[PDB]
């Protein structure tokens, strides 16, 4: 937060970059992976897409019907 | 004891290795400094965190490994960085 | 030339061309407003530094 | 004629739109030249116009008043606004150190009413009379001369009905909801758990509409094994402060504190005795007639048809609250895509509850 040294008064804000986020945890925004990279998992793939990708990829379908999406 | 020098030394390794090819970069007792510790999250010094960023990005993506090699050494295999245990980091054992 | 402490003492100029980033626990400061790169002297030259805590947008020195 | 009429309206609108923007800039720059103030806490009262305080920006300094300053409300430990130049007390501020609306969870009213906690109506009738009744009308007890209970201990299996009852008490009231996570209570700092309870104790006295809810006190409580301390000092630090604030000369009339744990027998027996905690209430599984009102709430948000049967689950449901029925709606939500329908049949309710009944009780 912006604080004046001499006046001890807030004037303009400050850009937030390093918040002491507790680093050493990998943050990868929008990685590149596909379920077709490994075959034979289609039995497990159909279970992961419906329980994770399905409530996410379509936002408006589950919100209009009032269906809460599982968070894990 | 100097914090921040480890990130510069590792970066200078791959930059110098491109000048003279057909070289092998070896690391002894990586558990001394450590690949994973409790000082990364709790502590205020940045050494291994910035070292792993320069280790994975510089070597793997744009740098061919034919004439450039990186070999580590350790004692307890379970005390290393779990980021390296994932596929796409360390294969030959 | 290794320098492990980058701090000034009571340096105030203007608005623009002030900077004075202090790594000491007392009176920390940050600099916003885009990217600013200088070949040699940023503000006072010399003690200008970063060390362990990266302050905003300044890599080059 | 009509050419100048269109430009006349566009010229007037551009003036009024920019006038509100220029007036804010002129008003903001006037507040940027104001002088800040210091902050300190009163240690001991020296004299009338002279005080002995301890500033938070440095060492202690002798202070005073200036003009139109109330000296009756200034007591020991009261945070005061110290002047920079004259070094006197100007404004009056409450007693706070760490933010209680950020580090401590603060919430107003509630998102879960008392109709979704149904099935507990045996306990609900008791809880409302010992909480809602004394809080809204405490003066009825002063005529008889009795005292209302302070804390309310609600134990049981974790995760079932605990989140619902937390917001349900503050929903029927509308007061502040103070949540105290057991993780942030035990830390390594200077005066960690002491300042958490004391400032919460003072914030509850200064602001009457405040409800404190504790979750999983077994970490901060417990008898341990030999009652010895090895890195255990934070457990006794929290327990001893809770019992000391209640039996002191300052009690909490309108303040209610709700605690939760895994087992009541694993806690400190000193708290369970009367005089501090007068309320010990078990939270068992709800009955069959109480789960019908729950199934008409969460399923109402889920899009369905008019032929949906609400009596299909009540036969196959055993102790299923609003948290467990949402798992049935998750499986029912994925089924509507396979059959290309916007609703679910009444048979989907029986198959979803039967799957949960195998894992649960």
Curated annotation (Swiss-Prot), chain A:
Coiled coil: none annotated. The modification Phosphotyrosine is found at residue 35. N-acetylated by NAT1. It is found in: Cytoplasm; Nucleus. Belongs to the AAA ATPase family. The 26S proteasome is involved in the ATP-dependent degradation of ubiquitinated proteins. The regulatory (or ATPase) complex confers ATP dependency and substrate specificity to the 26S complex. This is 26S proteasome regulatory subunit 6A. The chain holds residues 146 to 217 of 434 of the full protein.
Curated annotation (Swiss-Prot), chain B:
It is found in: Cytoplasm; Nucleus. Coiled coil: none annotated. The N-terminus is blocked. It comes from the Eukaryota. Present with 105 molecules/cell in log phase SD medium. Belongs to the AAA ATPase family. The 26S proteasome is involved in the ATP-dependent degradation of ubiquitinated proteins. The regulatory (or ATPase) complex confers ATP dependency and substrate specificity to the 26S complex. Interacts with UBR1 and CIC1. This is 26S proteasome regulatory subunit 7 homolog.
From Swiss-Prot, chain D:
One of its GO terms (cellular component) is proteasome complex. It comes from the Eukaryota. The keyword ATP-binding applies. ATP binds at residues 156-163. Keywords: Acetylation, ATP-binding, Nucleotide-binding, Proteasome. GO terms for biological process: ERAD pathway; nucleotide-excision repair; positive regulation of RNA polymerase II transcription preinitiation complex assembly; positive regulation of transcription elongation by RNA polymerase II; proteasome regulatory particle assembly; proteasome-mediated ubiquitin-dependent protein catabolic process. N-acetylated by NAT1. One of its GO terms (molecular function) is ubiquitin protein ligase binding. The keyword ATP-binding applies. The 26S proteasome is involved in the ATP-dependent degradation of ubiquitinated proteins. The regulatory (or ATPase) complex confers ATP dependency and substrate specificity to the 26S complex. Belongs to the AAA ATPase family. This is 26S proteasome subunit RPT4.
């Amino acid at each position: 937060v912006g604080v004046n040294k001499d006046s001890y008064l807030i004037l303009d804000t400050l850009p937030s970059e390093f918040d002491s986020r507790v680093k050493a945890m990998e943050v990868d925004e929008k990685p590149t992976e596909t379920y077709s990279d490994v075959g034979g998992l289609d039995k497990q793939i159909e279970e992961l897409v419906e329980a994770i990708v399905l409530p996410m990829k379509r936002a408006d379908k589950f919100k209009d019907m009032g269906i809460r999406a599982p968070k894990g | 004891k100097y914090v921040g020098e480890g990130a510069r030394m590792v970066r200078e390794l791959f930059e110098m290795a491109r000048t003279k090819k057909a070289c092998i970069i070896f690391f002894d007792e990586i558990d001394a400094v450590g690949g994973a510790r409790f000082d990364d999250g709790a502590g205020g010094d940045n050494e291994v965190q910035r070292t792993m960023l320069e280790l994975i990005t510089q070597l793997d993506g744009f740098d061919p490994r034919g004439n450039i090699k990186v070999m580590f050494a350790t004692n307890r295999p379970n005390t290393l960085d779990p980021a390296l245990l994932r596929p796409g980091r360390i294969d030959r054992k | 030339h290794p320098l492990q402490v980058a701090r000034c003492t009571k340096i105030i100029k203007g608005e623009d061309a002030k900077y004075v980033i202090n790594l000491k626990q007392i009176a920390k400061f940050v600099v916003g407003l885009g990217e600013r790169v200088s070949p040699t002297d940023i503000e006072e030259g010399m003690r200008v530094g970063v060390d362990r805590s990266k302050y905003n947008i300044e890599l080059p020195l | 004629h009509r050419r100048y009429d269109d430009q006349l309206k566009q010229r007037r609108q551009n003036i009024r739109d920019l006038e509100k923007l220029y007036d804010k800039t002129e008003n903001d720059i006037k507040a940027l030249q104001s002088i800040g103030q210091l902050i300190g806490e009163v240690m001991k009262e020296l004299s009338e116009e002279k005080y002995i305080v301890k500033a938070s920006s440095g060492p202690r300094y002798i202070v005073g008043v200036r003009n139109s300053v109330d000296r009756s409300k200034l007591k020991k430990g009261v945070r005061v606004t110290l002047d920079i130049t004259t070094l006197t007390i100007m404004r009056i501020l409450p007693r706070e150190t760490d933010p209680l609306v950020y580090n401590m969870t603060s919430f107003e009213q509630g998102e879960i009413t008392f109709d979704g906690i149904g099935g507990l109506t045996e306990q609900i009738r008791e809880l409302r009379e010992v909480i809602e009744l004394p809080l809204k009308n405490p003066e009825i007890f002063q005529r008889v001369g009795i005292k209302p209970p302070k804390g309310v201990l609600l134990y049981g299996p974790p995760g079932t009905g605990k989140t619902l009852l937390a917001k349900a008490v503050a929903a029927t009231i509308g007061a502040n909801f103070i949540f105290s996570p057991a993780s942030g209570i035990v830390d390594k700092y200077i005066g960690e758990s002491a300042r958490i309870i004391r400032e919460m104790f003072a914030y509850a006295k200064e602001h009457e509409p405040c409800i404190i809810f504790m979750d999983e006190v077994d970490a901060i409580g417990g008898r341990r094994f030999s009652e010895g301390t090895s890195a255990d000092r934070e457990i006794q630090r929290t327990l001893m402060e809770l019992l000391t604030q209640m039996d002191g000369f300052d009690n909490l009339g309108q303040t209610k504190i709700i605690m939760a744990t895994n087992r009541p027998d694993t806690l400190d027996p000193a708290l369970l005795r009367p005089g501090r905690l007068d309320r010990k209430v078990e939270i068992p599984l709800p009955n069959e007639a109480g789960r019908l009102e729950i199934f008409k709430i969460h399923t109402a948000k889920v899009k369905k048809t008019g032929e949906f049967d609400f009596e299909a689950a009540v036969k196959m449901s055993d102790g299923f609250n609003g948290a467990d029925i949402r798992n049935c709606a998750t499986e029912a939500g994925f089924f509507a895509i396979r059959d290309d329908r916007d609703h679910i049949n009444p048979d989907d309710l029986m198959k979803a509850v039967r799957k949960v009944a195998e894992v649960k009780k």
